[PDB]
Design a binder for these strands. Structure first.
Lengths: 81, 94, 108, 200, 96, 96, 81, 94, 102, 200, 200, 200
DNA sequence: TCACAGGATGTATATATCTGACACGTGCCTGGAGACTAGGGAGTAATCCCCTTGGCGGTTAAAACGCGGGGGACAGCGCGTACGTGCGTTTAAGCGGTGCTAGAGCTGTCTACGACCAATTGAGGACATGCCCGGGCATGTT
DNA sequence: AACATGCCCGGGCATGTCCTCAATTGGTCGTAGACAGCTCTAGCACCGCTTAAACGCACGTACGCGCTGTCCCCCGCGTTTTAACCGCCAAGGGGATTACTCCCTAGTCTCCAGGCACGTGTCAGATATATACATCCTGTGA
């Protein structure tokens, strides 16, 4: 797999910001958002995978994602926990 | 079959005592379970640290009553403290 | 043999006092757990559960629903200033957000 | 070396009512000599004056003599002969009356005698007995102890009992008493420490 | 023809996207981004749909909460428009 | 006479106070403020000097840390001077 | 006693902002700072006293403050703990 | 009378291995004791949750190795893991 | 003993602490060995950087200021200790470029 | 050197009601001799006139004599003979009647005798007794003390007691008294200091 | 007793670049021997193994010998012969090669020779020099010190310097070094204390 | 007694550049020995070590000697022989080398010789000269002074000069120096007092 | 800037179908409760030491207040680019099965590991015991 | 009366040994994990059709950025006042430690209900689709 960071579309970045109450945009936001998103998502994946390897599994479950988020101060409700 | 404990039952009895003509979606239910587990881990964890700090073996109503005041805002703490006091007061009286 | 009465029934609670006594006394929290401790905590959990469900049921009627959905839990938790501290870092699935639009963005 | 026997320490007042007494010195850190009734124990500096009072209910006959001897207080060491350590044994500190190796000396008295016992290997110092002055109630003998209790190769920190015996012209036992002795650099500090440890 | 004044659609969209609850990123694009990242740490890793939805909702929540703080930083600078400087400032203030 | 065209001293104070370690708040008044607050929760409380030392260091670290973020908000508004609204923003971004 | 918030003096507030690298400070900062500091102290002291009451003591120790700080997301080294 | 637990002996020893000529103030020794007790509580607390989550009965070098990789930054993690691996390897041989 | 693993940090104190603290019922004997190696390694990293910081200031002795600087001059330790306050630590001499005279 | 025995020091008024008295001198800096009833002690300068009064309830027989002797007050030193220090012993200050080494002299009395006792090695000075003169209830003897109490190799800061004995023609005992003596450079200063320490 | 001369202590590496070295021992309890580079001082327990390394820049000829001798560090004591205290001199701890009185012994070497010097009365121990074994940069001699520095009648708390001399078959100088030595019950504690005082 | 002559006190460095030196000791109240360059004076306790350094520009021949002698500083007293006081002369403190009456001794040195001059009655102590090691600039002789300056019948508070002379094996004068000496109980207190009087 | 008309979007109302939830029933599987006994923990009281709180005095620092000038902040105006909105076209996703393998989850059996208990030695700090110098008094000269 | 000068005890430090606690060593017993096997679910991959979203381009206005001007606010410096800081002392309270006694919790064994899982149907709810009405936004007119 390559370049799926471009799968995070410009309108999708619009809609996320619109939910956040954002009214008007500079085109620099799209590339900066993708970098910030990649860093947050990578940090969660790395913890989730680490739980998965500890349990000696091949498959990441929601509980692994839940614990990976939770420790960063991000308690997630609705996927088990 | 293998069994997993969840609070869906008691969550769907508490609602019937508050809004008898309403129900809960499976996802809202799942949220109320993670909320219970979270608050439970927080209070149990703080009651554990209180016993540890005081170099003492037993968790009691006191360690929980102190953890509650620490974790909840003051308005919620007083009401939760009231209910916790009444439950233990009745349980020991009955 | 005396016929069984559950500690939940004795305390007048709905939450399961035995399960809570298990979750306290085993699973690496404590050296010992006294019998009044599960009762106290079941009441506490029951109280906060009832508060969230009371507020969420109102948000459901405000939407002419009879079924509580994740949106209604989010609305209850953010509208209540105290619940918004206790759960201030929690993320809720399909929660949505409050209709907060900053005044400087409005037309004039 | 080791002795063939252990001297008896048992108090025996005898026909004359023989008993001991000591002065009311303070507990200043470096006081020369001081005594504790609570411990029945003397604390004193090396070679300094150590006054011991002799009390009787009636006056012994002429020719009576007073002897002093030392034994280890701990039962394990009672068979060893108490003597000066090899260093103080070699030092040139004899007064012209005492042998080099004896632990106990008497000062002031010209009629003193010192014995190395051929049968028991024990060491002892002896003087003639003398009665009190009219109006006085006891006779004072002034001893000197010629090694600290801590000396290696000698007492080696082991406590000692001084045994005092009242004897006839021939050495026959007329009476006997004993007290514990510590020879140390700071008798007052040490005495207070032991008296405080008596409450613990 | 009709035509809106530049900048007025936003207030409807703000209300719509604040009021609705569905996911704002499409499923397949996000799913492949997760796999593209994860392969860098371990090949042949495999995924539960619940896990991928869990990752997505955390990412949308993170970006939405970031965008709100970014918006306030822009308002504080008296700007109408958000910029990378607003993103950078909010993140730095949170210690990220 | 001579007097400073302003701010060179301010940069020297920044250098000096960033270099030093000691308390910048007064040694005794803070201890009375702790008593004035604490008596609201319980009378006749007693205070270890080490405990008050801990409160001071925590309060200074909090305030200094707050002043860093306040400084960045001000730079973002392209101002030389910090303002209450800078403090309110950083706190609000930080979830206070 | 009373009126010790005025004991958080103006130049001391200045010095704390000098560590924060602040070049110029507006006159309204000092009261805003006092109110913010008072909130912080109230939250720390309230939790500390709650630890001290739990132990049934009358004396707050460094450990009571250290635990009160720790749970507010702020760990303090050098005072025990 | 009373006696206390601290790491001052070992902090002093480690300092001599990195800078044999350098001393340490009691205040800095105090910081080092807090640092050790903190990192310990984090690793012990995290290893405890790994064991709880997998419902395993014991903390091992595995739970510690994983908690370290979860708590430390990547570079510190590599070296910490290498030292823990050598320690267990040597301890097993000794 | 500590000489078995070659560590300066006391394994059995760690073992006893892991038996209490309610972390777990039980322990594998490699666990305190592994954890002692980690706490010792991290202790060495801080003390080595702190000794260098003392030398930069020309002092023969580490003071809390030198720990504060040493921790922040390594961004890994700065992230590990991002929410820690140091007694008498002071702060970094950072001045934003927009403030300097021009 | 050491003596074979110790002289008796017990007070004994006897058949004649014997006792001692002293002049009411002040405590000024230039005073040569002064006495303290509170301490039973005389303070005096070396070689200066030291008046001692003898009091009696009735007059002793003709041929009665008065003797003075010095002994150390501390019991371990009592067997040492009190004498002048080696410096004052070698100096040329003899009056033609007193031997060079004697501590106590009597001035103004041609009938004086000085004894170095062949059996005890003790020094003493003796004069005939004479009854009081017109206007006095007592007979005054003028002593001189020939070393300071501080003299090294002599008294060496040890306090001494002067023993006065009233004696018959054979030297048998008719009465006895004693007083402490300090021989010093500033008697008034020293007397005041010791009397002030009596309240500390 | 005293000596007719003082040995030279001056450092002299000579034609062979002679130097000393010591092991990297810790400062824990029960540690047998530990050396301080900062103080140029060795701390050790009585009779325990004390390794001293010999370093050279080029190899001395065969028949070269190594000699160790102790002198007091303070200049007025330098003429006194360092020896064991009377207690340890009498105790039965000889190894069949060393005389009872010598402070320094070498263990593990049968070519050892112990000299009580006829002209200077100094004690010294001598062994042949040997070049390093294969894989080594230096040659190690194991010394033992047979009294504590605090021993009364021996070193009596006075510091000593050990002088090491490299010398030919006739005893002519080839190289020389020295180090201070403290023989004590807790070498770790004392080493730490003296190293910590160096910063005060 | 009085001498027939007064030794020359005039400084003379001679062919070898002879000079004296002294240690940089402070003025702690009871320091054992301390020297004042401003007064050219040594302050020291009785029988304690007094290190005097010997400085030369080139090494004197073998058989060279160093002699010390004492004279009174005041011209009224220069003809009197400086000697110990009658007390310290009688006391048994001879080291096996020094006569009882000599004021100055040299400690540590076995080759010392003591002279009571038949023609001048002056006491003096002599030792052979010894050179320093090639990187050390001076040789230290350790004198002892066996009476306080204040001893009555001896120095009697009169100041003294110590005269040091370098000599050949026949006694011919190779060099000479001198310094004032005060022997007292508190050398630091006294040195400070006399140096403070140098501003009064 | 203010009022009215047209266009577009949102909200409200009505109808039909499918899924979810709820309710009910049945069955299954521990889990919880009930009862009894044993050991430790916690609670209470007494004693001892350390720390905190409170008080007093002196000296300097810090804080507070005032005045003058410069710099910054805030407001207003002008010009250009960027972004927004709308329209058309293209691409991918979403939705809905179809097919196969890997892993996940669970169960069974045996070995190792961990815990628990007793006896012997070393680590670590506290205590045991002695010498120096300083403080200050003791004793003499001018 | 002030200074001259010696001597003894105290504070503190120097240095050897003891007591308490953990490690080491060894043995015994039970549980959990590891290892192996089996069964089913979920995941992954593939294909087709339909719609939505996305992407690119075109056209216009709003916002951003820069520049300029005026006033207010803050800094800098000096002087005066107030409290802090420092040092030392006194008394009481609280905390800590030790010992003893009773209650509480844990552990063990047995029985019944609670909870959970699975299945079915209905109702309700929600979702989806269509129509009508109201509100908001933009342009036109004065």
């Amino acid at each position: 797999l390559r370049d799926n960071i471009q799968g995070i579309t410009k309108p999708a970045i619009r809609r996320l910001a619109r939910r956040g109450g954002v009214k008007r945009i500079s085109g620099l936001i799209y590339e900066e958002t993708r970098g910030v998103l990649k860093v947050f998502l990578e940090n969660v994946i790395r913890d989730a995978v680490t739980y998965t390897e500890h349990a000696k599994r091949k498959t990441v479950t929601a509980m692994d994602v839940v614990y990976a988020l939770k420790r960063q101060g991000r308690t997630l409700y609705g996927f088990g926990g | 079959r293998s069994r997993k404990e969840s609070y869906s039952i008691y969550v769907y009895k508490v609602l019937k005592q508050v809004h008898p003509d309403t129900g809960i979606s499976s996802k809202a239910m799942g949220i109320m379970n993670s909320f219970v587990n979270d608050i439970f881990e927080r209070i149990a964890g703080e009651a554990s640290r209180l016993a540890h700090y005081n170099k003492r073996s037993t968790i009691t109503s006191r360690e929980i009553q102190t953890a509650v005041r620490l974790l909840l805002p003051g308005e919620l703490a007083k009401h939760a403290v009231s209910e916790g006091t009444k439950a233990v007061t009745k349980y020991t009286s009955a | 043999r005396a016929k069984a009465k559950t500690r939940s029934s004795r305390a007048g609670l709905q939450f399961p006092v035995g399960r809570v006594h298990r979750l306290l006394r085993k699973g690496n929290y404590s050296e010992r757990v006294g019998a009044g401790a599960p009762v106290y905590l079941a009441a506490v959990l029951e109280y906060l559960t009832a508060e969230i469900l009371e507020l969420a049921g109102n948000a459901a009627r405000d939407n002419k629903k009879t079924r509580i959905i994740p949106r209604h839990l989010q609305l209850a938790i953010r509208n209540d200033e105290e619940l918004n501290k206790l759960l201030g870092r929690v993320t809720i699935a399909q929660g949505g957000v409050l209709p907060n639009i900053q005044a400087v963005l409005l037309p004039k | 070396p080791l002795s063939s026997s252990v001297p008896s320490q048992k108090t025996y007042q005898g026909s004359y009512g023989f008993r001991l007494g000591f002065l009311h010195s303070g507990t200043a850190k470096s006081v020369t000599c001081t005594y504790s009734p609570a411990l029945n124990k003397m604390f004193c500096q090396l070679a300094k004056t150590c006054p011991v009072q002799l009390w009787v209910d009636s006056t012994p006959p002429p020719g009576t003599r007073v002897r002093a001897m030392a034994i280890y207080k701990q039962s394990q060491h009672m068979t060893e002969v108490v003597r000066r350590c090899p260093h103080h044994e070699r030092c040139s500190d004899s007064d012209g009356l005492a042998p080099p190796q004896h632990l106990i000396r008497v000062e002031g008295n010209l009629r003193v005698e010192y014995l190395d016992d051929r049968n028991t290997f024990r060491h002892s110092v002896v003087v003639p007995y003398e009665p009190p002055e009219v109006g006085s109630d006891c006779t004072t003998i002034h001893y000197n102890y010629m090694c600290n209790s801590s000396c290696m190769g000698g007492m080696n920190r082991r406590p000692i009992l001084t045994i005092i015996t009242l004897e006839d012209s021939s050495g026959n036992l007329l009476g006997r008493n004993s007290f514990e002795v510590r020879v140390c650099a700071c008798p007052g500090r040490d005495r207070r420490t032991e008296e405080e440890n008596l409450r613990k | 023809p009709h035509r809106y004044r530049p900048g007025t659609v936003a207030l409807r969209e703000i209300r719509r996207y604040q009021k609705s609850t569905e996911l704002l990123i499409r499923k397949l694009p996000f799913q492949r981004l997760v796999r593209e990242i994860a392969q860098d740490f371990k090949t042949d890793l495999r995924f539960q749909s619940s896990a991928v939805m869990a990752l997505q909702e955390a990412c949308e929540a993170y970006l939405v909460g970031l965008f709100e703080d970014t918006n306030l930083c822009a308002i504080h600078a008296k700007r109408v428009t958000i910029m990378p400087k607003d993103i950078q400032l909010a993140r730095r203030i949170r210690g990220e």
